[PDB]
Ligand binder design. Structure first.
Ligand SMILES: Nc1nc2c(ncn2[C@@H]2O[C@H](COP(=O)(O)OP(=O)(O)CP(=O)(O)O)[C@@H](O)[C@H]2O)c(=O)[nH]1
Ligand code: MET
Ligand SMILES: [Mg+2]
Ligand SMILES: [Zn+2]
Lengths: 117, 267, 470, 77
RNA sequence: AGCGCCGUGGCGCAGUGGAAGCGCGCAGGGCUCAUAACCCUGAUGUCCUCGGAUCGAAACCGAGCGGCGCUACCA
């Protein structure tokens, strides 16, 4: 009843290369397609590179020369570490704060680990 | 209005240790201004320049910054200082930098006072810095003793009482210190009670806290109790925390428990 | 436009709240199923057994909702040493129309005495059939003494088996054997994994499990498919707990005692010590009723060594300041439940692992600490907990004199030296203090493959007393 | 964690189960390249290698101590 | 949950008190027949968001954020 198919709700990233400006207008769409806080998505995506662009609206803006496969790999690794729990196949899992750090919690079950780095 | 060398006379002395700020280097070396004595320019020749062999004059000078130095001769007829940097003992370089720091702090305070009062800084130093440096060896110790003792200003003639008030305020907000003394006591009690015992030791240790210097002993762990105090003079805390140790030992040795000391009182 | 918290508060007040325990009720009439006992304290201890990397804390959390910590940074992920606790309330629907399987509903500790049913279409409420305590026990090959202690505390069993791995896993067999050692037969077998499996793989695994339990002590043990992640089929487990497992004989006649398995210190850091709390010994009461403000002594207590190498035991007398049970501070305690006795025992004595398996007796009793004990031992044939790669699961050899062997007398975890070897009896010399009150159930483990490995069971017959030093 | 990487050349990130001077002795011969064991002010381990031989030091830790071979990242540079 | 640290110029390190720091990078130029080596010049920042004393704060202080590290799950 619950799973007629037996997760794959991860859209192909769309990055626009305007010569000198790389725009990713898919950050909020993947925020709603992964059930994450967009502020945390943006803070991680800044913390992985040497860049901290601009937030506009539902989109991240950076000014340089960059590819599109890089953030596909970034998204897949991020899914393996946060978006999908290692223990179970679920996306709806997300980050709460039970101390001072971020505690990773699930929504199908409620698994409680400390995944914040 | 920035003038009025820190020390007594306009003329720097011989063989003295100084800290020089660089402005200009053409061919003979660096004739530079001085920020330890008066701003009379002291000239440095290439021979006295580099401890190593000079490889590129651009790198080793770094114009616009201070470097340790010594003065060989002083022209006491119109002003021509002969100055060097390589002939300084490596042990006294940090001390030269410390003297530069002390002078710079004092002059920042007194420059604030002058720019606030529009009083010539020479007037302020001749009424403030010189008498204090005589009375206490240095103006920095004079200001520090002004923080604790208000009698350091007695026997001195200010140009205006407003100078005294504003200067004391800026010292009390800018020279506010007081080193934390911290220690850790272990409770090894396997005993019958031991929460009322720690409560009683807490009462008899926290009551000891004087007005100027309080001993508040926080909790971080059941065995490890921390001992934190603000030692204004850095020598009361040793005996206060030794008293805390003797109090906790007297509390424990009769009720049944045992405790030792992990970290003794250290600055 | 009510906030969710406001709606929960309204449902809590509507459900009668949680009536406070009487200060001085008639005990000769109190039963473990009485309303006053059942509302704020658990009466039966249920422990879970399973193999590593399967998930027992997850199932306990799904059943109740009380989290099991899993502390100590390194142990946050791999394995826990201290036991896990969780309070669940058995609530059954009073309405006959709704189906029996989903009538039962297990709730968490601070729920009201009667919550509203969550099934759509039933205006009925729930009634509290029983309050159950959960003692999660480690299932790793290194940590056995804690598991044996908690199984001694344990009164009801939940065995967890997952299907997709090898059918004859050894850890569950070892835990079942340990439970069979200490007079416990109410075992409920639970299938961890059913979702990712095919309809015939599950049947084959069930046939394997049935084949497994045919010659062991437990015979009529039910098997129930459950889920730890999807959180389904929990009401059926609740029904099986209600039906299969009765109340072990536990009345108020027998003398009071305490068996502390965990030591908890209450020292909130950062707060000034002016307002502190006493130290807490987490102990199970299997026999007796404990009340607020009682005098109690830890029997083995202060172990010290004199300059001559002699072992001195100083019993730790203390007054009970509080008896924390379930969720709220209570006035009286019920045997058959893990309760935190918060006394004036020095907090450093309850720091990490000091009161792990210690007997404690209320003032008005004289337990006996022993140095040399007489034990009756019975062995098994094949060592359980080992995967032999196709050759004769190891045969247990006979014991030899002067070998340090782990003799888990109930909760006490000690390494005893054998002084005498015969067909059934053995003299155990104890360097660590151990005590005997009536019989005590005991487990025996040897060191044959590095870590401790169970061999058989043991019962104390006699002992050499050590007179307390007052 | 335990992140190991090579930056144009130097290897930063070195588990110390084996001696670092022994690391120099097992690098210098086979690689024939200059290597400097420099202690930076409190970063990870620094070992030099003249000439770009990143795949060669890949082969090297394959030979001596490499046991994971997945967190070692070949930098572009 | 507290206490001991941090807040980058791609990075490491510094003084924080009169106002962008040094070096490692990057680019460009000089050297040389040429390369390397060497030498010169640059452009990369709310040195983390918000306030206070102060002619002035990146710092001196905090009313908190984000990450570290010690206690240790801190009923
Ligand atoms: N797919 C699946 N995963 C499960 C199930 N139950 C638990 N898990 C997984 O197990 C993990 C939790 O394991 P945990 O309960 O800590 O194991 P453990 O009880 O400590 C093993 P031990 O008792 O030997 O110490 C979760 O991350 C979860 O994904 C299940 O029914 N299905
Ligand atoms: C002593 S462990 C059982 C739960 C405990 N009384 C709470 O807190
Ligand atoms: Mg556990
Ligand atoms: Zn999950």
């Amino acid at each position: 009843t619950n799973n007629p198919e037996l997760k794959f709700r991860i859209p192909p990233p769309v990055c626009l290369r305007d010569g000198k400006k790389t725009i990713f207008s898919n950050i909020q769409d993947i925020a709603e397609k992964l059930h994450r806080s967009p502020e945390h998505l943006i803070q991680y995506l800044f913390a992985e590179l040497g860049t901290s662009g601009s937030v506009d609206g539902k989109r991240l803006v950076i000014k340089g020369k960059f590819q599109s496969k890089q953030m596909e790999n970034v998204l897949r690794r991020y899914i393996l570490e946060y978006v999908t729990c290692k223990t179970c196949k679920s996306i709806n899992t997300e980050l709460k704060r039970e101390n001072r750090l971020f505690f990773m919690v699930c929504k199908s079950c409620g698994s409680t680990r400390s995944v914040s780095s | 209005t920035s003038h009025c060398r820190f020390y007594e006379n306009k003329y720097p002395e011989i063989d003295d240790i100084v800290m020089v700020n660089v402005q200009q280097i053409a061919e003979m070396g660096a004739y530079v201004k001085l920020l330890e004595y008066d701003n009379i320019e002291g000239m440095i020749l290439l021979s006295e320049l580099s401890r190593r062999r000079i490889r590129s004059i651009q790198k080793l000078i770094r114009v616009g910054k201070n470097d340790v130095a010594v003065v060989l001769r002083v022209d006491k007829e119109k002003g021509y200082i002969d100055l060097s940097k390589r002939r300084v003992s490596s042990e006294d370089i940090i001390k030269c930098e410390e003297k530069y720091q002390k002078s710079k702090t004092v002059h920042s305070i007194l420059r604030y006072c002058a720019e606030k009062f529009q009083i010539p800084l020479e007037e302020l130093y001749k009424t403030i810095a010189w008498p204090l440096s005589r009375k206490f060896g240095h103006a920095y110790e004079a200001f520090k003793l002004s923080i604790i003792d208000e009698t350091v200003w007695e026997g001195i003639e200010p140009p205006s009482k407003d100078v005294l008030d504003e200067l004391k305020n800026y010292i009390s907000k800018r020279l506010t210190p007081a080193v934390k003394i911290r220690a850790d006591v272990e409770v090894s009690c396997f005993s019958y009670e031991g929460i009322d015992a720690i409560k009683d030791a807490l009462k008899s240790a926290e009551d000891m806290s004087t007005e100027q210097m309080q001993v508040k002993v926080k909790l971080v762990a059941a065995p490890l109790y921390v001992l934190t105090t603000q030692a204004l003079d850095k020598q009361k805390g040793i005996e206060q925390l030794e008293s805390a140790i003797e109090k906790i030992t007297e509390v424990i040795t009769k009720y049944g428990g045992v405790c030792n000391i992990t970290m003794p009182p250290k600055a | 436009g009510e906030t969710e918290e406001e709606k929960r508060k309204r449902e809590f007040e509507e459900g009668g709240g949680l009536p406070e325990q009487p200060l001085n009720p008639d005990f000769s009439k109190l039963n473990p199923l009485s309303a006053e006992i059942i509302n704020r304290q658990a009466t039966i201890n249920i422990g879970t057994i399973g193999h590593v990397a399967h998930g027992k804390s997850t199932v306990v959390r799904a059943i109740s909702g009380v989290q099991t910590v899993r502390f100590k940074d390194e142990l946050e992920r791999n394995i826990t040493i201290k036991l896990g606790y969780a309070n669940a309330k058995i609530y059954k629907c009073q309405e006959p129309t709704c189906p029996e399987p989903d009538c039962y509903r297990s709730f968490k500790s601070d729920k009201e005495i009667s919550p509203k049913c969550q099934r759509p279409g039933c205006p009925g409420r729930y009634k509290l059939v029983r309050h159950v305590s959960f003692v999660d026990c480690p299932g790793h090959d290194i940590l056995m003494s804690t598991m044996l202690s908690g199984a001694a505390v344990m009164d009801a069993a939940l065995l967890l088996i997952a299907g997709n791995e090898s059918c004859p896993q050894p850890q569950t067999s070892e835990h079942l054997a340990a439970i069979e050692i200490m007079k416990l037969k109410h075992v409920i077998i639970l299938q961890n994994k059913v979702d990712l499996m095919r309809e015939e793989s599950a049947l084959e695994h069930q046939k394997s499990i049935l084949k497994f339990i045919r010659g062991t002590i437990a015979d009529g043990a039910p098997i129930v498919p459950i889920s730890a992640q999807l959180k389904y089929n929990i009401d059926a487990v609740n029904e099986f707990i209600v039906k299969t497992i009765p109340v072990p004989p536990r009345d108020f006649m027998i003398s009071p005692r305490l068996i502390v398995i965990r030591s908890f210190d209450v020292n909130k850091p950062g707060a000034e010590i002016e307002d502190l709390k006493g130290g807490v010994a987490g102990g199970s009461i299997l026999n007796g009723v404990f009340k607020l403000g009682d005098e109690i002594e830890i029997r083995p207590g202060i172990v010290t060594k004199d300059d001559k190498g002699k072992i001195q035991c100083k019993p730790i007398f203390s007054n009970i300041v509080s008896l924390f049970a379930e969720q709220n501070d209570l006035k009286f305690a019920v045997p058959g439940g893990l309760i935190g006795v918060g006394t004036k025992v020095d907090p450093t004595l309850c720091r990490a692992d000091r009161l792990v398996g210690q007997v404690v007796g209320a003032k008005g009793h004289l337990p006996n600490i022993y140095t040399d004990i007489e034990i009756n031992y019975f062995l098994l044939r094949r060592l359980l907990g080992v995967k032999t790669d196709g050759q004769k699961q190891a045969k247990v050899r006979k014991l030899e004199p002067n070998e340090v062997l782990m003799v888990n007398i109930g909760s006490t975890a000690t390494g005893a030296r054998v002084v005498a070897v015969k067909a059934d009896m053995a003299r155990l010399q104890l360097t660590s203090p151990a005590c005997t009150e009536i019989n005590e159930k005991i487990a025996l483990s040897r060191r044959i493959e590095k870590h401790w490995r169970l061999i058989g069971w043991a019962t104390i017959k006699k002992g050499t007393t050590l007179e307390p030093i007052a | 964690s335990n992140y190991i990487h090579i930056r144009i050349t130097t290897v930063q990130g070195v588990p110390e189960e084996y001696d670092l001077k022994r690391i120099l002795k097992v690098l210098k011969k086979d690689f024939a390249c200059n290597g400097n064991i420099v202690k930076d002010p409190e970063m990870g381990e620094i070992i030099q290698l003249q000439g770009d031989q990143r795949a060669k030091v890949c082969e090297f830790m394959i030979s001596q101590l490499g046991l994971q071979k997945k967190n070692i990242k070949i930098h572009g540079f």
